[model samples]
Every structure is written in structure tokens, then in C-alpha cells.
Target: MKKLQIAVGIIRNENNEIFITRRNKLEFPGGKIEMGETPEQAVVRELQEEVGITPQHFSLFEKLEYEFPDRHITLWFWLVERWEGEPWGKEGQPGEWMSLVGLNADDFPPANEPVIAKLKRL
Candidate 1:
């Protein structure tokens, strides 16, 4: 199976709330990595494209892999420490900042459940 690489940004506000978009379900701001783009660059672009924010400071958090029937996906998760603009869903989906204490596995996709669980522990 062909493998897809994705870069995800885990954005946190000063109030310790996490930022995410809710279309069908809650998800982080991110998408697939394009050719010739670094993971960091991809995440920066993805955040700007999906959410109206520019990352000012960020660091790698974790790398996760998942397998589906059609393709395998490698997810690069990053912790965005600071940003330049307010985060809003630019792609028509609703965006919100949620308290980490209120998050549960069912709030996100299966591919993101493990990461969410891991984040809750921190």
C-alpha cells in the first residue's frame, strides 16, 4: 500500500484549551505533506490553510503510523507553542478551543484517538 505522510499541529491557547475543527467530527488542523516539503513546512502551511494562523514557535511532539485498507499513513504531530494570528476554520468547518479536561476518545477519529489519549496523559 502507498503510504501518505501528514503533518498535524496541536495548538494550545494560554488558557490550556486545545484548538480543533469540527466538521463531521473533531480534528486537528493539518493535512497531507506535499512533495518537496519538509514536515515542519507542511504543518505550517496546513495550519495556515485550514486555520487562519501562522506558527511562530513549534516543536515536534510525536510521530504516529496507522494502517487502513487502502493506504498507510504516517502522522507527524507538532506542538505549536506560539502563533501569529487567531485560529479560525477557514475551510467552512466550525473551529473551537476546547478544554483538554473535557476531551474524550470519541471526540476524534480512530487515527487520532491514540494521540488524544497520549495528550491527555500530559
Candidate 2:
């Protein structure tokens, strides 16, 4: 079996709305964990690469495992408490700050469904 890993960050503003990216659909900012990089490092790099933000403070939120038909993945989700720069979708994707209270699971990828469910309880 093949395995892959990804590191994603979850950021919320004063309004309690989470930051998300819209590229055909909605998703948090993140990317695949690179070789020889820790999950934490991967997240920091990915956020800057994808969203153009450098987090000043963050912490691990959860580690989720998903098994797809062809491959399995381990997703590391981080809670970004503070950041030094504003986030924009550097890749030209649309971004938004959304409230979790009224979020619809269908808006994001299926792999992200469990993460959204867990976040709503927090």
C-alpha cells in the first residue's frame, strides 16, 4: 500500500470565522509534506506557499488518518493562533473567512469532511 501525508492549518479570526480557499471547491491552506520535513515545518512552508501568510504562533490540533481505495493519507491539522501577514490566495484561488457554525460539509473535499466535523465541536 502507498501512503502520503499532508499538513494543513486552521486559522480563525476575531469574528470566529475560519480561513478557507476556494479552488473549484473549499478547503484549508496546505500541501503535501515534503521529504525530510516535519509536519510542523511542512505546514509553515505550505501556508506561506499557498496563502502567503507566515504564522507567528500555532499549535497542533489533530492528526487524522484516511484510507482511500488506492492510497492512505495522514493529515496533520494545526491551529494557527497568530500570524505576521495577512493571507491571500497567492495561487489566484479565491479565499474567504467563513463561519463554522453554518458551514456545509458538502462545500469541501470528502477527505476534509471529518476535519470539519471535529472542528464544529471546538
Candidate 3:
């Protein structure tokens, strides 16, 4: 499998919940990185496209690598302190800015292990 670079935003609210999105299309929104884009840059753009807001002071937390059925990916994880805009569906994506209290690994699809594990401790 060929390696792909991907990015994700860790949108944590005041209650310590993180924002997760389910797209209208079956395709994973967090797909392969675009040309000439840094991981952080790609995530910022992805955040706006899927979640309707840009993070207001986020930090890079982790770099995760995972391989599924046939694709290999390098995942970039970020910690967002604040953001602007309502949780509306941009790019036809519906999102959940959810709490960590009831989050389980099974709730999300594969490639989200690093995110869930790191947030559980915060």
C-alpha cells in the first residue's frame, strides 16, 4: 500500500468534548493530503470545510501512522482550545462536538485510536 498523509482537528469544547463529524458521503472526509500543504495547514482547511469553523489556538498533539485494508496513512492530531462559528453542516458533514465521558473506541471507525486514547487522559 502507498503511504498517505492526513490531518485532523481536535476540537475540544469547554466541557472537554471533542468535535467529530460524519459526512453525507460515505467517503472519509479526512482523506489524503493535498499538494504543497503542511499537515497543520491541511487540518485548518479541513476543519473549516467540514466543521464550519477554524480553530482559535490549537496545538499539534500527535502524529499517528495507521494502515487499513490497503491504504497506509500518517495522521496528524491537533488540540484546539477555541473556535468560532456554529456547528453547522458545511460540505454536507454533520458533526458531534461530544464529551469524552462516554466515548468508546468502537464509536468511531478505525484510524481514530490515537485521538481517543490521548483525549481520554486529558
Q: What TM-score, computed on C-alpha atoms, does each candidate reach?
A: 0.90, 0.88, 0.79
What's the distance in Å from true for residue 101, model 2?
Answer: 1.5
lDDT (CA) for every model shown?
Answer: 0.90, 0.88, 0.71
Rank the candidate models, highest lDDT first: 1, 2, 3
Per-residue CA lDDT of model 3 for 66-101, tens digit only, reads: 678788878787777777886556776666666788
Please state the error at residue 47 of candidate 1 in Å. 0.5
Task: Give the distance in Å from residue 100's predicted Cα in candidate 2 to where it truly belongs.
Answer: 1.8
lDDT of 2 by residue, 1-122 (tens): 88799999998777778999987888899989988998889999999988888877888888998798889999999999889789988988899888979788898998778778888877
Off by over 4 Å in 2: 67-72
Error of 1 at 61 (Å): 1.4
Better of 1 and 3 by lDDT: 1
| Model 3 clashing residue pairs (backbone) | none
| Residue-level lDDT for 15 in candidate 2 | 76
RMSD of 3: 3.4
